[PDB]
């Protein structure tokens, strides 16, 4: 599956180089411009546990998912990963618990120490 592919061939985009967030670009975006901290960000995504046991999509709710980058309205991995993307890019992320929900998890949706997979499309970003 996609999660294994990202383990095999994904780029480690962490500062600490701890393989806690791994990325493959699956479709290239446009521009050199990528979002700065505080940017308003628009994505479609689909997510699961790497176990495959719970699943989640923006599509499910009709409309795009919208958040302020680097304001921890998301897990740290998204702040990190999204910030590396271009308008129009789709990428795959594999995330260790430390850049997601940690040893406390987030029951019942997320268990302790969970690895997460996401597919993310970056639709747009506007400045605060
Ligand atoms: C742990 O809680 C949830 C996690 C996730 C989805 C959830 C959660 O219930 C609140 O509900 C469906 C979407 C509600 O949307 C606004 C909330 C974002 C919560 C913060 O979530 C995150 O930061 C990340 C990244 C942005 C998309 C949502 N994501 C999740 O981890 C998903 C999760 C993905 C893996 C399968 C289970 C759901």
From Swiss-Prot:
Residues 30-118 form the PPIase FKBP-type domain. Widely expressed, enriched in testis compared to other tissues. Acetylation impairs ability to promote interaction between Akt/AKT1 and PHLPP1. Deacetylation by SIRT7 promotes interaction between Akt/AKT1 and PHLPP1, leading to suppress Akt/AKT1 activation. It comes from the Eukaryota. The modification N6-acetyllysine is found at residue 16. It is found in: Cytoplasm; Nucleus. Part of a heteromultimeric cytoplasmic complex with HSP90AA1, HSPA1A/HSPA1B and steroid receptors. Upon ligand binding dissociates from the complex and FKBP4 takes its place. Interacts with functionally mature heterooligomeric progesterone receptor complexes along with HSP90 and TEBP. Interacts with NR3C1. Interacts with Akt/AKT1 and PHLPP1; enhancing dephosphorylation and subsequent activation of Akt/AKT1. Interacts with IFI44L; this interaction modulates the kinase activity of IKBKB and IKBKE. Interacts with IKBKB and IKBKE. Immunophilin protein with PPIase and co-chaperone activities. Component of unligated steroid receptors heterocomplexes through interaction with heat-shock protein 90 (HSP90). Plays a role in the intracellular trafficking of heterooligomeric forms of steroid hormone receptors maintaining the complex into the cytoplasm when unliganded. Acts as a regulator of Akt/AKT1 activity by promoting the interaction between Akt/AKT1 and PHLPP1, thereby enhancing dephosphorylation and subsequent activation of Akt/AKT1. This is Peptidyl-prolyl cis-trans isomerase FKBP5.
């Amino acid at each position: 599956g996609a999660p294994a592919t990202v383990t095999e061939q994904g780029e480690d985009i962490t500062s600490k180089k701890d393989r806690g967030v791994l990325k493959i670009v699956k479709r290239v975006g446009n521009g050199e411009e990528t979002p700065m901290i505080g940017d308003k960000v628009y994505v479609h995504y689909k997510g699961k546990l790497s176990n495959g046991k719970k699943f989640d999509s923006s599509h499910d709710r009709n409309e795009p998912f919208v958040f302020s980058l680097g304001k921890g309205q998301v897990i740290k991995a998204w702040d990190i990963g999204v910030a590396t993307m271009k308008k129009g890019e789709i990428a795959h992320l594999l995330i260790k618990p430390e850049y997601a929900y940690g040893s406390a998890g987030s029951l019942p949706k997320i268990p302790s120490n969970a690895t997460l997979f996401f597919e993310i499309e970056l639709l747009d970003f506007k400045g605060e």
